[PDB]
Swiss-Prot record:
Full protein stretch here: 858 to 994 of 1793
Membrane topology: Peripheral membrane protein
Compartments (UniProt record): Nucleus, Nuclear pore complex; Nucleus membrane
Protein's UniProt name: Nucleoporin NUP145N
Segments forming domain Peptidase S59: 2-137
Source species, domain of life: Eukaryota
Region (Nucleoporin RNA-binding motif (NRM)): 3-136
Length: 138
């Protein structure tokens, strides 16, 4: 477990004017002890309920980032939060855990690169964080 957060904060976004809230740049939803989703393009938050986002629209649990869990209420690609994003997930160690090193650790990284429907960004062997991009959440 861990606290969810967003950046810009919900209060920052509420203080934006009408043109600004339709194109929020750098929008990031994170959760302590899990990781983060950084949206890569400006997002229109004018019709999203910022008080019912965490755990409802964006769900972060260890090794699991989900955006729009209800298939009947998921906008098309390019609308809302269904847009390109950079996802960074803690706890992405080799199957044998944080102590795996050497040749197996090299192959682990190569297998992370091949995970379908992701574009590998990085793997940090010290922290166990795997980062990758997605084009959308469809």
């Amino acid at each position: 477990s861990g606290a969810y957060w967003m950046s810009p904060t919900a209060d920052d976004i509420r203080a934006m004017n009408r043109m600004q809230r339709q194109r929020v740049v750098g929008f990031t939803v994170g959760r302590e002890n899990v990781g983060s989703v950084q949206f890569k393009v400006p997002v229109d938050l004018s019709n999203i309920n910022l008080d019912d986002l965490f755990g409802t629209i964006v769900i972060l649990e260890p090794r699991s980032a989900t955006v729009y869990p209800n298939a009947a209420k998921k906008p098309p690609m390019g609308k809302g939060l269904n847009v390109p994003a950079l996802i960074s997930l803690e706890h992405s160690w080799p199957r044998g855990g944080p102590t795996i090193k050497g040749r197996r650790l090299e192959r682990h990284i190569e297998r992370l690169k091949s995970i379908p429907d992701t574009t590998f960004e990085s793997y940090d062997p010290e922290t166990g964080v795997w980062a990758f991009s997605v084009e959308h959440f469809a």
